[PDB]
């Protein structure tokens, strides 16, 4: 039938060979709202 999708963005993270391994103990927020409406949906819509 179809599968309609749009590109959102790119996120870059540093990483070292000898780095003291760590975890982000808190979540990170990134804006996504650019293309959810471009996909023909409202902010409270459904998507993946």
């Amino acid at each position: 039938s179809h599968s309609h999708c749009e590109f959102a963005g790119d996120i870059f993270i540093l990483g070292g060979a000898n780095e003291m391994p760590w975890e982000f103990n808190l979540p990170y927020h990134f804006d996504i709202s650019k293309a959810v409406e471009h996909l023909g949906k409202k902010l409270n819509g459904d998507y993946v």
Partner: protein
């Protein structure tokens, strides 16, 4: 359809053009079915 009147039907069937798909299958150990899906452009489903 007895013998002397189906050969022309077979000739007609061969004369009209056809499309086809090919397989090279072998033993798998358990009898099973095969399903064909025709993916077409629009993404792809």
């Amino acid at each position: 359809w007895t013998i002397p009147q189906l050969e022309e039907v077979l000739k007609r069937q061969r004369a009209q053009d056809r499309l086809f798909a090919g397989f090279l299958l072998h033993n798998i150990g358990t009898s099973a079915d095969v399903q064909l899906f025709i993916c077409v452009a629009t993404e792809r489903n």
